């Protein structure tokens, strides 16, 4: 599904059947069946509003109405907001559609089409994380009648938001920020997870317009005696239910003018919330936050940062790419793919800034070469999806259609989620090491175990994941 | 003494002084006290405002687990509303509370607000004047307030540094216009709030703009040594977002001892020029002139080395425009790093930035670096603490108060030529307050020291018996009629004499 390079696509909603794409002056409703346009809603900035934008020092390619917030309201109404040439507006479309409300959107919708902002429409309320000023120096996290402290750098210091998750009566915000936490900070960037209660109603008297529950914690995506940190978070995934554990997968990278490198980490949702229960660095949801004391609300506004850092699953990155030419930029996971032995493996898809998608799993071999358990990365495939230079912005998985939608700035491409049908050679089927593809010996076809039925006591199917890739091939006779 | 008419001695230390422009009644705000007087300094009413139980750690509603103790109530604001006859007085207690009292009888309280509005310190500045503003288009007046961060309570962060405040009965003393991301308000950021303090000296309104005369550190970061400068804070009065919040520095520079900078301003007064002075400045006689006294300071402490400097508001407006034009052309840094981190000025297609420029979203909180500069018309060996200017005579005479209690008169004939013609003590050993106001006819001037107020006559030509004494006094108010043996101004002589030398000035002729 191709458009110009000038527009800037942003997945604003995704189902297994349809996806909504906000672009330069329109929003598309696209079928995942064939990436075919199903519906369109055009909304162009008025010539006076976009002459005002170029007047204030912007270019032609900046002064457009980039659609960047979507939400279907519980009444059938449609909430739709756009940058409107650095003058963000929100509209209420009601049924096709017809305009029913138009109003300013400062603090509800970014000014710039950059992937700087995020939001979460949780329980009929929009939680927004963006800038509220044309100059981009007033970051905030805003809900109906509640915002963070304006220009308070201890709460937000030049942040770039990468995602927002709803969870258990909180709303989590994922972003990278400037470091003023350490007394000897020197323009360092650290990645945070923030939290606000959904039943927050502001503090008493003058605090009635500000959060009484904003807390943040640093994310730890480090590699031993010689630590190696990936401090700039780039993309997150939705919450993934891997068995009994809820996990969030994230892509991290090193800072500029540092050893270039990318990593993928995963954090348990329970570990994220547990960090907000430890010490503060020098939050519970009460039914009426307007009953708190001035002492308590002023405290949390002066200690919004937790002491402990959220640790990573397995205590290390699941994949690392250091000193390579490309950087990782997006993440998506197919959870709990049952292998031939009956083990469940999450299959991880991570796109690079030059249009590749890496597929891999992790195996936790218990005492294979030492007494401490050793985690290993099994890379299934690293193929080129987009043209050689184009950055992959997002990934959307459709486990139903066995399709992976790759999102660039001006296109959507779909590829197979699992390549079992494509391969026809025994060596290829075992060297692939996909937890879902296994080589049959009665039938010569490399088969997909989602539709097949093994029985644990039959030598029919053949699969090798723990070994090396050449060792999997030796299992093939002749 | 015959030059001093009435003297009123008060029991407490006095903080402020204003005169009703139509009734000439005198209002005096002091420590634990509040007085109303007649135009002849006869006491009408007196109000006990303190002491009361209060702690700086506590607000009115809550007192954290800290005890309230009897503390003095320093008067910080004294103002009159003309549309609705009512006096506004703000005290230091209870996080800086204002009361609204009746103008006929100050003992009557009409409205008591709990809002924290004013500095709760005894020495932290607070400047307040009433002028047109929002919410409505400029038919309603608002209160522009500027408060220093006293740094003694958590409740102090809530109070803005510069803000417009409503005078509506429904929304008394609330910020005039406020929205989600913007409003009639400027705060100092959490990182500079406790270290970068702002001293507000004088406030005034002129030609659709509100102004503040401030002393403050030139730089927020610690990369440079501490230098104190005088700044000028401006906001468009139509502006309900403070998009027009702008500052330029104010320099009063002298030739003496190589380079001499009088960096610390002590007092300000807005007034009109004379025929001769308006020609020098290149302004009309109806235009405004800012009179201010600057003192060279060792750090933040003013020394006994002051100077008198005048600024025309045509050159103030043209200097603001000069700093704004330059930013909107992309040159330099926006400034005001102590509000938010200073980002570069943006290049803009703006084609008609003039003197009335009222602000936009872009380059909004602008800190000018190009100062308005003036050479003082007079310098002094004492610390000057007040200033007032009248042009009842054909010449402008500037009244200057001393920290030692002296009153001096300077006559300003040009932007280059000025000199003292009178000097005498009003209250010896007692610093003259900054609030120094004239009578409605500009015939008497009210001089307030630590504990007294003195009604001083502006001129007295009758006490010059002979004529060499009349012209020798070099008083611009005094001439000498040829016929009658009286020293008196021109209007007092009768032009019935055939010779035009009937009334002669002190420099135009010889007696
Ligand atoms: C998130 O978790 C990871 C892993 O759990 C963690 O990485 C660990 O960091 C610590 C310190 O940053 C590393 O500890 C080092 O261990 C060696 C011994 O092998 C010590 O020598 C190190 O310094 C000590 O001794 C030095 C002797 O010269 C002294 O100079 C120094 O002052 C110290 O006394 C130090 O203890 C540890 O090896 C890594 N572990 C791994 C697996 O990488 C990371 O720090 C965590 N992040 C956050 C934000 O908490
Ligand atoms: C993108 O376009 C597709 C196709 O036009 C939209 O899907 C359609 O959505 C409507 C409205 O929800 C569905 O109608 C509803 O059907 C249910 C099921 O019977 C019924 O109970 C409701 O009363 C209503 O009639 C319609 O069936 C559905 N069509 C398909 C093929 O799925 C889709 O909603 C659009 N995207 C978004 C974000 O709305
Ligand atoms: C509070 O005021 C009372 C008068 O009602 C006074 O007796 C008391 O001493 C004050 N509190 C303190 C701690 O002094
Ligand atoms: C002024 O107010 C006080 C206090 O209410 C009252 O005692 C007095 O009688 C009033 N009028 C005059 C003329 O003093
Ligand atoms: C306030 O100023 C006066 C006069 O300068 C001084 O005597 C007093 O100690 C000061 N108070 C404080 C708390 O600095």
Residue numbers in the entry:
A (entry chain B): 53 to 147, 165 to 292, 294 to 352, 374 to 569
B (entry chain A): 62 to 126, 128 to 573
Quote the study that presented this structure, word for word:
We have discovered a distinct mode of interaction through which the Drosophila semaphorin Sema1b and mouse Sema6A mediate binding in cis to their cognate plexin receptors.
John Wiley & Sons, LtdIn the crystal of 2:2 complex, two pairs of 1:1 complexes are packed together in the asymmetric unit with a relative orientation of 168.8° to form a pseudo tetramer. Each Sema1b molecule binds to both PlexA molecules in the pseudo tetramer. There are therefore two independent interaction sites, A and B, involving two different Sema1b‐PlexA orientations.
